[PDB]
């Protein structure tokens, strides 16, 4: 009842100007079918066309909501409509796809990659797709992409459609007040959409009733602050597939905007996207375009669009005014949609490169960060890479760990006592059985009991855990008097001389196998680290089986123990193939970082039969 009481509508009551056809009025409807103010004299009244649409036919059955709103309504009430009535959360990102209204076909793998990226980026950020609504041209390709999404994957992409009300087929089929109306499958509305913002200017069978309202709604949502509350709004991409003359001026309006909206076009579809491609590669320094490529652009505009010399001249002038902001324009030339919106979010945030690195950490995209954030010519603040190092471990971003090691970060200068302590008390990442282990060793050391929830698990308690898990006459470097003295006097002396050993231990205690395999390659005493990791993983497997925990944890810990044992065996094979005597000295030299032990003793204590 709130939708009719808040949102208005307008209906064609005019003097019926015939113009060309006597039946066709200024609004194009039939002359006897009646019942802006200029020549249409339209009147305002509450709506009676809203509710739910049940898409009958066309593959999967999808219920898509709808409402008919006047074209001159303020976007604030519409934003309140999406946030309250249909129960849609505020997005992290907006999508705005435009294109040609005519139907077309593209390359098949171009369509497939376009569709797969347009689905996948919409899942990973939870963005809202803004289309042209009706099932024509590019929006039909969004519908096919969403059909493949319904056939293969499990998300519910909010894929908001904005179309004129006058052009949709079976207008009487969608008349009701909060009533589910069946719809069969002027042009048909797209079947695989989620909600509809069908806008009526009074006219029927005419476009232009939706562009200004969609533009104002995109501006109004772009002024809304994102939930990070750092001082930025949500970013907006401008997606172009092919298009015509109007999308050139849409691109110009998006570039000449405060704040600027970056636009990415694609290649292979043809027409306007191809002439942006031909302008973009053949550009030199932005607007400095030479004499051969200007008339090449003019003849391709006059050939592909079939316009005159002067019409091509104004389109080239608008193209040059668009290009003058070159840096927001990027082209996906064949040989995707994901990279477009990820780049657009990076330059719509317009923040520093630590913020870009943290956002790529959030999206788990190592290739995007490598191609864009870590390109040549990127300035870096002092100490921001170390914070990104910490944020990339608390989360299992081994690939981002590999990237950051390859781009200048050293483990010797980063790992401190306090940083490894904060690594040991993280709450992110996968689950682990470490809390049960420290609870058991504090119960054994001080017979108390259950640890407090706000407990800072000290490295001395970690060392006691390595004591209970190793067994025998082991004595870890944490529990020795030197480390306890330094811990009492502090809570390059606090830096670890051998940090990858501690990274091994923290990766083993918390069941992060991929970082353990990465940290086995980097650093030294790989045989000792592999045998210690094998004994540790076997002992946490036995401890997890002893304390009636989940058996899958015990099976995966046994698998990790067998992987580390196989690594130790194959390392022994390589050492035997290279040099026998140096392999003997590898097998017998005393391990100062592992309680003065021997690799042979560690293999026997791990019960490793193949070694």
């Amino acid at each position: 009842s709130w939708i009719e009481r808040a949102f208005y509508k307008r209906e064609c009551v005019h003097i019926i100007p015939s113009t060309k056809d006597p039946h066709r009025c200024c609004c194009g409807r039939l002359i006897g079918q009646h019942v802006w103010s200029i020549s249409k004299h339209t009147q305002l009244s509450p709506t009676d066309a809203f509710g739910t649409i049940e898409f009958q036919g066309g593959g999967h059955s999808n219920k898509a909501m709808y409402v008919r709103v006047s074209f001159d309504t303020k976007p604030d009430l519409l934003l309140h409509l999406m946030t309250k009535e249909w129960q849609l959360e505020l997005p992290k990102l907006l999508i705005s796809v435009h294109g040609g209204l005519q139907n077309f076909e593209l390359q098949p793998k171009l369509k497939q990659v376009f569709g797969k990226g347009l689905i996948k980026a919409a899942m990973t950020t939870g963005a809202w797709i803004f289309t042209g609504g009706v099932n024509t041209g590019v929006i039909r390709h969004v519908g096919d992409a969403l059909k493949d999404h319904a056939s293969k994957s499990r998300g519910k992409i909010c894929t908001i459609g904005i179309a004129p009300w006058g052009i949709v087929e079976n207008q009487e089929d969608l008349i009701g007040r909060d009533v589910v109306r069946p719809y069969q499958t002027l042009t048909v509305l797209n079947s695989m959409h989620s909600h509809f913002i069908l806008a009526d200017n009074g006219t029927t069978g005419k476009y232009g009733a939706e562009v200004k309202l969609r533009r104002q709604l995109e501006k109004h949502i772009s002024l809304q602050k994102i939930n990070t509350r750092i001082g930025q709004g949500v970013p907006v991409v401008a997606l172009i597939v092919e298009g015509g003359p109007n999308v050139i001026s849409i691109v110009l309006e998006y570039l000449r905007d405060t704040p600027p909206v970056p636009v990415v076009v694609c290649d292979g579809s043809g027409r306007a996207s191809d002439i942006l491609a031909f302008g973009h590669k053949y550009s030199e320094e932005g607007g400095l375009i030479n004499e051969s490529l200007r008339d090449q652009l003019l003849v391709t505009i006059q050939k592909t669009f079939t316009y005159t010399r002067t019409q091509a001249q104004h389109l080239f002038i608008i193209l040059m005014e668009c290009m003058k902001k070159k840096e927001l324009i990027t082209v996906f030339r064949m040989g995707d949609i994901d990279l477009a919106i990820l780049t657009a979010l990076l330059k719509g945030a317009n923040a520093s490169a630590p913020d870009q690195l943290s956002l790529a950490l959030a999206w788990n995209r190592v290739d995007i960060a490598r191609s864009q954030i870590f390109i040549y010519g990127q300035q870096w603040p002092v100490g921001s890479l170390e914070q990104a190092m910490l944020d990339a471990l608390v989360l299992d971003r081994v690939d981002f760990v590999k990237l950051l090691i390859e781009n200048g970060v050293s483990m010797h200068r980063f790992l401190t006592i306090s940083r490894l302590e904060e690594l040991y008390n993280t709450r992110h990442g996968p689950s682990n059985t470490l809390y049960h282990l420290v609870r058991d060793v504090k119960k054994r050391e001080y017979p108390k009991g259950n640890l407090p929830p706000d407990y800072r698990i000290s490295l001395i308690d970690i060392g006691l855990v390595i004591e209970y898990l190793m067994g025998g006459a082991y004595r870890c470097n944490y529990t020795r008097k030197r480390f306890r003295t330094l811990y009492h006097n502090l809570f390059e002396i606090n830096h670890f001389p051998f940090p990858f050993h501690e990274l091994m231990v923290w990766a083993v205690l918390m069941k992060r196998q991929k970082m353990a395999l990465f940290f086995w390659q980097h650093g030294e005493e790989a045989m000792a680290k592999a045998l210690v990791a094998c004994k540790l993983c076997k002992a946490m497997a036995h401890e997890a089986s002893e304390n009636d925990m989940v058996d899958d944890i015990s099976q995966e810990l046994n698998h990790n123990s067998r992987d580390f044992g196989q690594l130790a065996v194959e390392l022994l094979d390589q050492s035997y193939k290279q040099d026998e005597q140096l392999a003997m000295k590898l097998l017998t030299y005393e391990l100062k970082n592992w309680s003065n032990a021997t690799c042979l003793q560690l293999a026997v204590a791990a019960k490793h039969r193949d070694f």
């Binding site: 051969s292 008339d295 090449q296 003849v299 391709t300 040989g335």
Partner: peptide
Amino acid sequence: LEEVNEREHSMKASLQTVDIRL
């Protein structure tokens, strides 16, 4: 073959420019 496709684009654009000269 990618070297073929890059230089066939240059030859086709040059042929369209020569046809515009005619």
